[PDB]
A paper describes a structure:
Because the DNA-bound TFs are fixed at particular positions relative to each other, the contact surfaces required for cooperative DNA-facilitated binding are very small, and can evolve rapidly. The structures included two BARHL2 homodimers with two spacings, HOXB13 homodimer and TEAD4–HOXB13, MEIS1–HOXB13 and FOXK1–ELF1 heterodimers.
Recently released versions of RoseTTAFold (RoseTTAFold2NA v.0.2)39 and AlphaFold (AlphaFold v.3.0), which can predict the structures of protein–nucleic acid complexes, performed much better in predicting the overall geometry of TF–TF–DNA complexes.
Author numbering: 232 to 291
Amino acid sequence: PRKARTAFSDHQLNQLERSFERQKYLSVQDRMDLAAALNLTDTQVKTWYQNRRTKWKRQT
DNA sequence: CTAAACGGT
DNA sequence: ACCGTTTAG
Ligand code: NA
């Protein structure tokens, strides 16, 4: 029973990506604040940031 | 494409 | 929490 696949708002993405630009890795508090600000789960943001780095690493 | 899962660090 | 790799909405 898979977790239901998230669909991010344009705005969410936008602000995520903005975060990722500023900082490629977030403290736990930073993660939490962001999650709140975007009305996402810690885990939502966490996984997002991972796959994001994962893609980043595909450029570097 | 990419969010989520898996298993080992 | 993360990585790398893989699974699947
Ligand atoms: Na680090």
